[PDB]
Design a protein around this nucleic acid. Sequence first.
DNA 1: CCGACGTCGCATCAGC
DNA 2: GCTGATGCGA
DNA 3: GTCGG
Length: 326
Amino acid sequence: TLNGGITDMLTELANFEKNVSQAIHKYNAYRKAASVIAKYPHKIKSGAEAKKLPGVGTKILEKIDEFLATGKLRKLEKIRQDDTSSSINFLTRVSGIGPSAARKFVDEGIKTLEDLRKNEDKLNHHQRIGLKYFGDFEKRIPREEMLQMQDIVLNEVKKVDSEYIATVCGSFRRGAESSGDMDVLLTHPSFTSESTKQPKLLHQVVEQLQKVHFITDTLSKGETKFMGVCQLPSKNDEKEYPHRRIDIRLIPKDQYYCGVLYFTGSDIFNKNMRAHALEKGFTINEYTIRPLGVTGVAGEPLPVDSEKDIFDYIQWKYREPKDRSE
DNA sequence: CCGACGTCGCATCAGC
DNA sequence: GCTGATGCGA
DNA sequence: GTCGG
Ligand SMILES: Nc1ccn([C@H]2C[C@H](O)[C@H](COP(=O)(O)OP(=O)(O)[C@@](F)(Cl)P(=O)(O)O)O2)c(=O)n1
Ligand SMILES: Nc1ccn([C@H]2C[C@H](O)[C@@H](COP(=O)(O)O)O2)c(=O)n1
Ligand SMILES: [Cl-]
Ligand SMILES: [Mg+2]
Ligand SMILES: [Mg+2]
Ligand code: NA
Ligand code: NA
Ligand code: NA
């Protein structure tokens, strides 16, 4: 990409701040600057040129000048050499190991893939499954495989109850040619913002997908969110497909547009859009858009009849999902 | 200068 | 058990 | 780390 060296550098800094420094606002700031630079349609010639973009300030402009001049950033050259940061950054690549657990594992002398496998009983359930599929979860999913997965999920959901609607969101809904995982939004007319007239609505779908051996493992599961593992079936003599991460979110049916806006993302798009909502006097979550009083307290939910209704409230022109890959 | 930075589900733990 | 952080994830 | 009041 046009500015890929710069955006990779800022992403690596973002990850350092999240995983090692445990500085969540610096993580978000670096990711915001990387995103706005990734969409900038010119090859950046200087830090000052980048500083014009919102989210790029003085410090990143200086790093961009060092990176343009040398092809490298000394700050990151040193981070790469620090064994503690190297260890923590590896360990946090296991699903379920976050910055806190990674640093505690390092204190205990658990710092390598071999150390983790030797100490499975020091892992919670999520982490144990993250370790099992460590290699698989860094592989990307071709859209062609996403389409096969979509067919299975949609048809199995229809067999449980033809009134379910499952919608694949995430980068797939933004039209990406490959995805890191599969995100499924689920609705049923029995579950609305006003009542839950039938229990186990998510459970029944999960159990059906386990029954046909599509869902293979569970990371976490509650009444409205499933986080787990799935796998396409392979044909005779074929090597098996990698196991994939799957997330299923059951959303009140009358709140589908706020739910599908949220689950379509990207994550940075959502942060930018919700931050703009706040500046406009609204707050948006996956359920509603509500006004803010002078209070600072959220009012009653506003009527939403399309994704574009949400954009309208905050005075944004509509952006199709394919234009939300921030 | 400096307060705010998106919003929330599930797992886990501490305190009572 | 309940409640309220905290961690980790979407 | 950046921004806006
Ligand atoms: N911090 C987050 C993370 C996710 N999300 C929402 C938006 C996003 O599209 C996301 C789906 O989560 P995921 O991490 O799978 O993000 P994707 O957009 O699907 C992806 F592009 Cl990173 P992919 O999963 O395809 O690699 O849920 C969010 O709002 N905030
Ligand atoms: N998972 C879903 C997807 C769509 N829908 C409903 C919301 C709208 O009334 C209707 C329109 O379909 P679509 O917008 O997906 O073209 O589908 C739902 O209730 N649950
Ligand atoms: Cl709400
Ligand atoms: Mg995804
Ligand atoms: Mg602000
Ligand atoms: Na700027
Ligand atoms: Na992790
Ligand atoms: Na996901």
